[PDB]
Amino acid sequence: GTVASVAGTATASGIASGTVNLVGGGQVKNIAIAAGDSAKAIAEKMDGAIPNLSARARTVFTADVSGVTGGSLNFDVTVGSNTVSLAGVTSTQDLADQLNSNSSKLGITASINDKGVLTITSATGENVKFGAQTGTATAGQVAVKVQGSDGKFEAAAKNVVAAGTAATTTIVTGYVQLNSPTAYSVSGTGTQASQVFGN
């Protein structure tokens, strides 16, 4: 078991260019992965690429705001091609509320429960990118745990926004979930495929 290093987590640069080699049902197919591709785009390319292969994409993560002091957090959020500016965020509830106010523009669901767990979904698998911290806070972070194709959330969080020293892993790429009644393999040179699928 190795998990993907880009899909299903937050990274600095998102998906790297590469080629995915698919073999199954006696067919061989090569799929171009473009730099910055979303799970949505990758799934669109892979779905039905060989017979019976299903590919679905979703970007789902929990987000927690912690340690905000000296002011409040301001930062942009981009989902796919749509961007909004959040400001005055000091708690997870604040984040939830502002994501919800912007939910139509962003094409997301942002659901926070009474235990403070905020789950954010791009149902089709668009990338979610966090902008630089431009608010007054002198400390504080937004940290995320992303869901994988196995339905499990990361147990360890990564900062996507931080006051003071900037977060580095700001791009959440969703998962690509493959299913098939028949055997198939996915591979690539180096990490070109495993950045999406693990090994």
Numbering used by the authors: 180 to 378
Article, verbatim:
Here we show that in the Pseudomonas aeruginosa PAO1 strain, a bacterium that forms a ridged filament with a dimerization of its flagellin outer domains, motility is categorically dependent on these flagellin outer domains. Moreover, a comprehensive network of intermolecular interactions connecting the inner domains to the outer domains, the outer domains to one another, and the outer domains back to the inner domain filament core, is required for motility.
Although the cryo-EM structure of the PAO1 filament achieved near-atomic resolution for the inner core of the filament, the resolution of the outer domains was substantially lower, prohibiting even the tracing of the main chain of the D2 and D3 domains. Thus, we expressed and purified the fragment of FliC between residues 178–395 that forms the D2 and D3 domains and crystallized both the native protein and its selenomethionine derivative in the P2 space group with 2 molecules in the asymmetric unit. Employing multi-wavelength anomalous dispersion (MAD) phasing methods, we arrived at a 1.47 Å resolution structure revealing the D2 and D3 domains as a contiguous barrel-like structure composed predominantly of β-strands, with D3 positioned directly above D2 along the filament axis towards the distal end of the filament. Starting from the N-terminus, the first β-strand is incorporated into the D3 moiety, before the backbone turns downward, forming one half of D2. The sequence between 243 and 353 is entirely a part of D3, after which the polypeptide chain returns to complete the fold of D2. The consequence of this organization is the tight packing of D2 and D3 which are oriented along the filament, instead of projecting away from it as in the S. Typhimurium.
